[PDB]
Amino acid sequence: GIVEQCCTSICSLYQLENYCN
Amino acid sequence: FVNQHLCGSDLVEALYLVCGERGFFYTKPT
């Protein structure tokens, strides 16, 4: 998902926007 | 534009400053 991906390595806040609403 | 690891409050504080308007809710997919 989003935690196992940015918490497993460094992702981008751009993909963090796909977890808004 | 950063290179910091995102996990608990780190990945969370991010969404908070990412959506703000639309909002957001931590997700826990199996």
From Swiss-Prot, chain B:
Stated consequence of mutating residue 22 to Q: In MODY10; reduces binding affinity to INSR; reduces biological activity; reduces folding properties
Protein name: Insulin B chain
Organism: Homo sapiens
